[PDB]
Every structure is written in structure tokens, then in C-alpha cells.
Symmetry: none
């Protein structure tokens, strides 16, 4: 991310609450790789 030299208080929040059915992908934070279906 923001590489720099110094990073102070950082707070991330990712979620998914009420999913009935899921046949695909629910990804929070994606930086690389491959995700199929």
C-alpha cells in the first residue's frame, strides 16, 4: 500500500452480514492472485 517510511494508526473494516445464497466471489481486499467463481 502506502509504503513510505512511517504509517501511524490505520484501521480497516471489511465484512458481509446477511447473505442468503452465494455462488460467486465475496472478496474483501484483493492485491493479487487468481480467483475463479
Amino acid at each position: 500500500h502506502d509504503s513510505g517510511y512511517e504509517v501511524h494508526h490505520q484501521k480497516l473494516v471489511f465484512f458481509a452480514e446477511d447473505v442468503g445464497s452465494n455462488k460467486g466471489a465475496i472478496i474483501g481486499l484483493m492485491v493479487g492472485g487468481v480467483v475463479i467463481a
Copy 2:
């Protein structure tokens, strides 16, 4: 992201609450990679 040298208080919030059905992709933050369906 904002690489720089210093990054103070940063706060991210991503979510998805009431999803009935999902057959595709629900991605919060995408920087790279491949996501199929």
C-alpha cells in the same frame, strides 16, 4: 496507495449487508489480480 513518507489516522469501512442471492463478484477494494465470476 498514497505512499509518501508518513500517513496519519486512516480509516476504511467496506461492507455489504443484505444480499439475497449472489452469482457474480462483490469486491471491496481491488488493486490487482484476476477475478472471474
Copy 3:
């Protein structure tokens, strides 16, 4: 993003609340990569 040298209080909020059906893509923040369907 805004690389610079210093970044103070930053706050992002992304969400999707009431989705009945989803067959495509629901992306919050997109910087790179490939997303198919």
C-alpha cells in the same frame, strides 16, 4: 492515491445494503486487475 509526503485523517465508507439478486459485479474501489462478470 494522493501520494505526497503526508496524509492526515482520511475516512472512506463504501457499502451496498439491500441487493435482491446480483449476477454482475459490485466493486467498491477499483485500482487495477481484471474482473469478469
Copy 4:
């Protein structure tokens, strides 16, 4: 229904295929009673 005296070959077909979310009522054949939400 068609009370009469005689009823020959009768064929009914009711269905619901692809429903994402449902918060109400999905009734096929209604003759009486009470259905709330």
C-alpha cells in the same frame, strides 16, 4: 372448484424459479384462510 359430478384428466402446474429475496408472500393457489406478510 368445478364440483359437478365428474372431472376427467386435470393438470395444474404452479412454480416460482429464480427468486433472489422474498419478504412478502408467494402463494400458488389460494382458496381461504389468512396470510400476513
Copy 5:
């Protein structure tokens, strides 16, 4: 139903195939009674 005296070949088909989420009522054939939510 069709009370009468005689009823020959009768065929009913009720179904619901792909329901993601359900918070209400999915009733096939209703003749009486009470159904709440």
C-alpha cells in the same frame, strides 16, 4: 375442491426452485388456517 361424485386422473405440481433468501411465506396450496410471516 370439485367434490362431485367421481374424479378421474388428477395431477398437481407445485414447487419453488431457486430461492436465495426468504423472510415471508411461500405457500403452494392454501385452503384455510392462518399463516403469519
Copy 6:
């Protein structure tokens, strides 16, 4: 149902195949009684 005197070949089919989540009622054939949620 069709009380009458005689009833020949009768065939009923009720089903529900792919339900992700269910918080309500999924009733096939309702003649009486009370069903809450």
C-alpha cells in the same frame, strides 16, 4: 378435498429445491391450523 364418493388416480407433487436461507414459512398444502413465522 373433492369428497364425493369415488376418487381415482390422484397424484400430488410439492417440493422446494434450492433455498439458501429461510426465516419464514415454506408450506406445501395448508388446510387448517396456525403457523407463526
